[PDB]
Amino acid sequence: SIPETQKGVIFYESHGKLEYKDIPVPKPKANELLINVKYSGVCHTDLHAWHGDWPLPVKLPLVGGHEGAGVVVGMGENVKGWKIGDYAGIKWLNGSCMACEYCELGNESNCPHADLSGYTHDGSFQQYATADAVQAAHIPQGTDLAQVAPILCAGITVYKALKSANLMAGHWVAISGAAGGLGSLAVQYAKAMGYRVLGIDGGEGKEELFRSIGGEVFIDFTKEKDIVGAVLKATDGGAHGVINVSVSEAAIEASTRYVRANGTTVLVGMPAGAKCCSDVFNQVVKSISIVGSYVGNRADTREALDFFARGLVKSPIKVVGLSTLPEIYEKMEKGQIVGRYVVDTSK
Amino acid sequence: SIPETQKGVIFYESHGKLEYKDIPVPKPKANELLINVKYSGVCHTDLHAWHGDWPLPVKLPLVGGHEGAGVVVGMGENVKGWKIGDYAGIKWLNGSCMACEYCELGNESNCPHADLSGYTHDGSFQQYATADAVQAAHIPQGTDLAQVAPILCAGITVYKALKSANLMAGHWVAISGAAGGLGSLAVQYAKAMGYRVLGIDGGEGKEELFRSIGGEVFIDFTKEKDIVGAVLKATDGGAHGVINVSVSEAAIEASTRYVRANGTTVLVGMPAGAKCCSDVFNQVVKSISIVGSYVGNRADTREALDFFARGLVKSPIKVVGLSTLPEIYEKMEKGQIVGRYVVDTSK
Amino acid sequence: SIPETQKGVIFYESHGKLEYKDIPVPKPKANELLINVKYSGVCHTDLHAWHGDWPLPVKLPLVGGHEGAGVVVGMGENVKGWKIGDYAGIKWLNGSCMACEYCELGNESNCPHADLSGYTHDGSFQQYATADAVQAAHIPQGTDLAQVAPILCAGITVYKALKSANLMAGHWVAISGAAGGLGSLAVQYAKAMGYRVLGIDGGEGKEELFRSIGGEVFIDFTKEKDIVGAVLKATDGGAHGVINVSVSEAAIEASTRYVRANGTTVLVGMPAGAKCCSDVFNQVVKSISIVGSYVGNRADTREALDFFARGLVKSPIKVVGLSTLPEIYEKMEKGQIVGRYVVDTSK
Amino acid sequence: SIPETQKGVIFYESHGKLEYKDIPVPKPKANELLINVKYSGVCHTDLHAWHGDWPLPVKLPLVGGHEGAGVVVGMGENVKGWKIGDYAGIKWLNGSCMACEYCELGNESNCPHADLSGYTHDGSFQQYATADAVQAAHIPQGTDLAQVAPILCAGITVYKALKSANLMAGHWVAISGAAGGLGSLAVQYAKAMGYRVLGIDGGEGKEELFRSIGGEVFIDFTKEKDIVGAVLKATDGGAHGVINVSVSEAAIEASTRYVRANGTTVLVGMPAGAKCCSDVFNQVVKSISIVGSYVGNRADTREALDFFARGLVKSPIKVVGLSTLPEIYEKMEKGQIVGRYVVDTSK
């Protein structure tokens, strides 16, 4: 039935050797599911984590990963709306307190008692993982789990960021980083949501990917000397919305400056040490809003998966073995990635 | 009955001598009210107009003023909803194209063809002024035009800001510089809107004043030094809303750090150099929004006036002669202005 | 160059003979466009005007029409944002006071002094008509004025209704009578807005049509009899939004019962007798809203036109001569109107 | 410690004899708290329940009551954020599934698996009761429990109904039934929320109560022949909001007809067999919304109690013995009640 030993990728100090090795299988707590993870998307977040790019410390030794699509093989005595066999999703937000003002308003990700997969809780870069039963993602039977894996962070994230840009069907959204993990999903969520899509990315056939997945206007940051100008021109006065999913502080500076007056620039990506600076005068006069968006809630999860089920968004994924995570991380830190890598935990 | 000559305050160069001289009485176009301004507010926005600072062309020869309280004394053929004897207010936004995206959404401020009182259009620093009938404030019968005049820029601006903060009755709002100028007004609207009010200011008896006008908690920048810590403590986790009257980089920056999760920190004035630098991490992790808020539209205005009608918002004013005006510009170009000054267009 | 005499369609009594006779060309006031209407829509609202049904005074002698597509051929002095040669649209709401609570909130429809095309103001059933410049639609260059004309009442009404339904991309919307008239248009906007579309209609091949225009599920009133049950089943718990084109008491009433919890059921047309009876229990227990939705404001309009610009909303039209008009009123006063009729003001 | 026997009021068939007798103390389930209830507000809902006024059946034999303010003396092994001694509130919504689309959106009351205090779950008309630990109301230590008891249904209910009327500080709200249990709280919530308050009730010193608790304009339905007229007059065109907490189908008819254009009428009260009927034309033309509101959620609970803690709302209560519930019910069915009766479970 349930083994005692499994394989994971784990590091013991920040930015230290990523070890592919045999580790213990974790036991569920009363609130938690034990999931046999079949695939895990790899999120740029997981790299920031390994590098120690963020002001919060990770749990060491840490098993990373937070886009885990697997099966429920065990559960706590306190878990309720779950059967053995159900498919489950391990997300960034392993678990919230579900008892504070924030969790009550559906801003579960902002709970100060938040427990995070691939940071403070052993994640989905292993064959077996634990996750809060209340927060976990109900994945419909029959879902190709390799394909859905990225909806679990990149998908819910950009979906919720779009809602928070307060667009309307027919308005322009500019996706900053349109070819990355988060970017190529945002592009589709946004087409599905009725927006006109402009994409800023750059690199080999990054454009091609963008066209193939429904985007309308592409601006290549490798070639366009005046990004702002192009956006302003392409959208006749600026993006009603901007979704910053680059890992560029620069790209973020620009997003403050090509967003439409009365528009909204959303911050999603979180580059090392990054500040968003904008001129006060300019932001006031133009009544521009700059909004931080942090993953999503359960309702965001249910909605975001519904888009995948209907077939309207689909990550451009390559499936490689878990034991190849050091390679994905090298590829990712060079922005070579066209969409998403998901790891098979069998290899 | 309607004069031909009038007294007013006008210049011929950027930073030219300010001529309290006689000038022609303007004739209203078919779309305008002609207004006999009895009192006008004076703020620093008028200073920057004079100085020729801000980017785009002033209209020389210019009569300044954008806070005009008067009586409709004449009107064009096209005018509707206005009677001779109605009390009218001349705001920053005098008129707009009424035929663009921005205008239609009640964001006329952001019109490409915006006509600006005391800038592109001769303003309230004169006995008789013209104004697009459609934007002009409908001051209610039985409003003291001296006491109401400053409300036409500061009051409405501050009311719009509080809406831009997007709070509900019972949420804490934090107002920087809360006892000086825009602050006092802010505090009073906030209170009248059901918000719990935290004030930050410093100096001779400002705490007393702040209490006397509805302020709940006062944080003293002279005697406290972990502002963030004390705002957090007092509001049990941060301020749902912030209005940033004081515009030091540091005061704004701190807002991003004492603002509650999912809260909104609002940028207000027209400061000609200030930057807002938010840590991307912290802004994303706490789901914070930084909303630039400009001048109110016609609905903002009617609403801001209704609270003042109800006796709920008062400004201490100091009434001196229009003839005295240059003296007051001159005191503003240093900083010898103690308080909120209203000009009497008869003296 | 601009004629003095013109042809138009005018009456002298409530339900009088409809004179296709020559009439003076109206002169625009300083606030108006003079428009050479090339095509006008014809709906039943024009029928009730003629008939003298609705409560308050028609303006005899009257030229009907409220769906006018033309070119700006002249303008008053006050007009802004308009050029000769611009294509313009004459809607139900022609002009308003622009100086009341209602006007300022973009709810001009509800103005006490609302000037209504083909009612209080001679409308689009004529070669040349005048219209308040501020409300007139800005039809984009490169729009076929025949195909666009009906969108000026039905299209916008139907677009506003869907907003009044307050749905998000991926929510089910249920549209009654979905293949006839307002329905087809509704369906197409809904689809273009990201909504999943359920249609209810009945009769000869309406299901086919409905599919051909984006409809997802079709519920056939001929062949099904637990409508509520089938709407519930198909939408897995009810329709987040309902647009009630068909106005039988029963069709509306049912809406309150197939609408999802927290959902919104929208009332649209101008039916001169219909009642909406909701069970208070059921409306309270399912937190249902019943929102009356009227004609779109200037922003509703610019948005509704932009979808049609993009090729996403088409109406089958049938173009017959303005001279032919009374025949069509006459067919409307019974119900011999097969489809959506547009008048050519040259023939 | 915890007795095995206690006293309750219980009936065995609908509208049957209300028995004051010795009953078993209930055992908590894993999810639940066992509360020693000290006081229970009595809600008109509890009467509708005993009479069988509503289309859903009660649990028989039923212990009524759903505004229970007491102490936590025991709890399930699965309960988490609770200590023995905490004060707890039993509300209408004993418990939701907390796992469906609705519960996720914070519309917990609309869960189809909803378990209801004083209908499907033994309520607070007894010394000891069970209640879901996740839904239960955290009452701050030191709260006078007799006074807070009504916040638990009447308070959260009207608070949430006001939010759902979408008013702004300065708009008029008309409370229909301003002197009843729900009414006198709505009046205060609304003053606290910055609205102008108009009240419709009637009966001995019902006005007096209204004045004493902060209401501005009272219209007595015992004396005013034209209620609509008076409201229209009193608020200069109608209530931006209406909160129907009468138990009159009539009063509800009127509320559809004195609500401001663009305003919102909220249905809260649920008289036997009641329909809300409104003219379609009138509701469309005026873009009026009619919205059902069903108690509140946890966040509504936390907010609503915060208003009581700050001292801004206070039920006008008489405290009598539980054993006197047949008398309260007789008084209530004659609309003699000026505010609220709370039952002491010691007598």
Ligand SMILES: NC(=O)c1ccc[n+]([C@@H]2O[C@H](COP(=O)(O)OP(=O)(O)OC[C@H]3O[C@@H](n4c(I)nc5c(N)ncnc54)[C@H](O)[C@@H]3O)[C@@H](O)[C@H]2O)c1
């Ligand atoms: N806030 C959240 O809830 C959240 C959720 C999930 C992920 N994230 C964060 O979003 C960021 C991106 O994660 P990702 O998984 O999409 O990154 P990726 O590496 O897969 O792709 C990023 C894209 O950025 C483009 N990009 C870059 I680097 N610089 C750019 C520039 N200057 N302009 C446009 N595109 C750029 C690259 O080409 C790449 O496609 C990371 O900081 C990650 O922590 C935030």
Ligand SMILES: NC(=O)c1ccc[n+]([C@@H]2O[C@H](COP(=O)(O)OP(=O)(O)OC[C@H]3O[C@@H](n4c(I)nc5c(N)ncnc54)[C@H](O)[C@@H]3O)[C@@H](O)[C@H]2O)c1
């Ligand atoms: N929907 C909900 O979430 C919810 C929550 C709590 C209570 N309720 C419902 O609200 C209704 C009122 O409950 P209550 O506890 O306030 O009722 P009350 O008896 O204490 O006072 C009701 C008032 O109605 C006045 N009233 C009446 I009877 N007819 C009136 C009329 N025609 N005009 C004005 N006031 C009227 C009476 O004078 C009384 O003060 C009941 O149907 C109850 O089920 C609904």
Ligand SMILES: [Zn+2]
């Ligand atoms: Zn929490």
Ligand SMILES: [Zn+2]
């Ligand atoms: Zn992630």
Ligand SMILES: [Zn+2]
């Ligand atoms: Zn000013």
Ligand SMILES: [Zn+2]
């Ligand atoms: Zn404009």
Ligand SMILES: [Zn+2]
């Ligand atoms: Zn029409």
Ligand SMILES: [Zn+2]
């Ligand atoms: Zn008006």
Ligand SMILES: [Zn+2]
């Ligand atoms: Zn539920």
Ligand SMILES: [Zn+2]
């Ligand atoms: Zn109740």
